[PDB]
Ligand SMILES: CCCCCCCC/C=C/CCCCCCCC(=O)OC[C@H](O)CO
Ligand SMILES: CCCCCCCC/C=C\CCCCCCCC(=O)OC[C@H](O)CO
Ligand SMILES: CCCCCCCC/C=C\CCCCCCCC(=O)OC[C@H](O)CO
Ligand SMILES: CCCCCCCC/C=C\CCCCCCCC(=O)OC[C@H](O)CO
Ligand SMILES: CCCCCCCC/C=C\CCCCCCCC(=O)OC[C@H](O)CO
Ligand SMILES: CCCCCCCC/C=C\CCCCCCCC(=O)OC[C@H](O)CO
């Protein structure tokens with residue numbers, strides 16, 4: 472059953488590679504290249520996931536599991552994760568999926584992303600994670616058809632509303648925005664409309680099949696890399712998230728090769744390698760501290776209306792802006 476992560480990861484990697492999904496550049500392309508493609512893709516996918524997650528929970532195929540709120544962890548970890556993603560040339564799992572494209576810089580970043588996240592959870596940096604955990608909010612939701620017992624607070628739980636209500640309100644506003652302003656300049660057939668539906672269906676399949684394997688969450692990155700390193704160095708068995716990372720790399724590699732876009736590549740200057748390795752370390756430190764990455768928090772947690780995920784994605788962007796100015 473854990474092997475469904477390979478299939479979901481495979482399909483996930485295809486969607487990432489064909490759409491060039493890099494959420495962090497959505498706010499940059501709209502102001503600097505007049506390209507709202509990633510922005511439209513982001514808001515539309517979140518809206519569909521808002522509706523899809525609550526619908527699949529209503530029919531008993533899954534339960535939403537919002538990540539716990541930790542003000543210190545979500546903010547500081549999110550900010551640091553934003554810094555490292557710029558140094559690492561990071562992306563919406565681009566450190567992961569561009570490994571299958573043939574970018575040797577991504578090979579470094581992933582290694583240092585995996586090591587740093589491993590070190591922060593259980594190694595030399597775990598003293599910092601242990602200190603951060605003292606600020607965890609005790610706010611929780613109780614068991615229902617919509618939520619796993621003990622999950623983090625959400626927009627509806629705080630407001631005391633059925634999760635259908637803010638999901639339908641915020642998604643309707645998101646859909647109105649994505650279609651209101653008609654998108655500007657891009658000729659890929661894999662347009663933001665078809666890519667949002669595919670990405671939402673993959674995220675729905677991910678949430679359903681992972682729950683059957685015992686991991687009650689949707690798509691993620693950081694936990695899969697830790698599970699892979701743990702299995703290689705401790706002989707621990709792999710789980711759904713570990714085989715998902717394998718599938719992502721495999722899926723992006725297949726898509727890049729079929730489209731003629733695979734090529735082993737090197738940066739123009741070797742110092743980029745040192746730059747993306749510190750980025751991977753910061754990404755590993757920041758993602759574990761914040762309790763999720765651009766996938767576990769932003770893509771998967773925001774549609775669940777999780778307060779921790781919305782707060783962490785705010786500082787993903789602020790950390791991105793900060794390091795983007797430091798570098799450029
Ligand atoms: C760290 C754990 C990693 C686990 C996952 C690792 C396996 C996934 C790798 C897929 C790369 C696929 C490589 C595809 C190579 C394409 C070659 C090509 O396209 O060559 C064209 C050229 O014209 C010559 O004929
Ligand atoms: C991680 C990169 C994401 C890039 C795509 C963002 C899409 C925004 C929609 C939902 C996000 C929910 C989180 C709320 C915070 C995001 C909005 C924000 O930070 O806006 C700042 C400023 O207005 C900008 O010009
Ligand atoms: C950090 C983990 C990184 C894991 C590694 C990344 C995934 C695999 C990448 C490349 C392998 C493919 C080999 C590339 C060689 C070109 C493809 C090929 O097979 O070419 C044969 C040629 O056509 C005969 O004439
Ligand atoms: C033996 C190995 C020692 C490890 C050596 C490397 C330390 C990196 C670890 C965490 C830094 C993560 C980001 C730190 C953000 C600092 C801002 C802050 O709030 O500091 C709190 C203070 O550290 C609370 O005692
Ligand atoms: C955004 C525009 C397109 C919208 C597309 C989505 C369609 C939504 C239709 C009905 C949802 C609201 C009614 C669904 C039933 C909710 C009430 C309910 O059954 O709750 C039972 C109990 O609370 C737990 O088992
Ligand atoms: C009860 C049903 C519940 C829902 C179940 C859904 C099952 C279908 C899922 C996805 C199909 C849509 C996939 C669309 C793929 C389009 C690929 C594309 O864009 O093709 C470009 C073309 O090949 C360039 O030459």
Ligand SMILES: CCCCCCCC/C=C\CCCCCCCC(=O)OC[C@H](O)CO
Nearest residue numbers: 482485486489660661669670672673675676
């Ligand atoms: C509803 C609950 C789940 C039910 C089961 C739903 C299964 C949906 C899974 C995958 C569909 C999308 C798969 C990815 C298709 C990608 C096609 C593509 O990327 O084509 C680009 C084209 O080549 C131009 O560049």
Ligand SMILES: CCCCCCCC/C=C\CCCCCCCC(=O)OC[C@H](O)CO
Nearest residue numbers: 585698699700701702703704706707708709
């Ligand atoms: C089958 C192993 C083939 C050789 C490994 C390729 C090189 C790995 C080196 C770095 C990648 C770090 C993550 C690699 C993930 C490997 C997962 C693994 O080895 O799992 C063992 C399993 O847990 C036992 O029951």
Ligand SMILES: CCCCCCCC/C=C\CCCCCCCC(=O)OC[C@H](O)CO
Nearest residue numbers: 542608626629630641777778779781782783
């Ligand atoms: C929930 C209020 C109803 C209106 C909703 C409007 C649409 C979404 C706008 C903002 C939500 C984003 C939330 C981002 C995370 C904030 C959580 C937070 O800051 O909590 C501080 C608190 O003091 C810790 O004890």
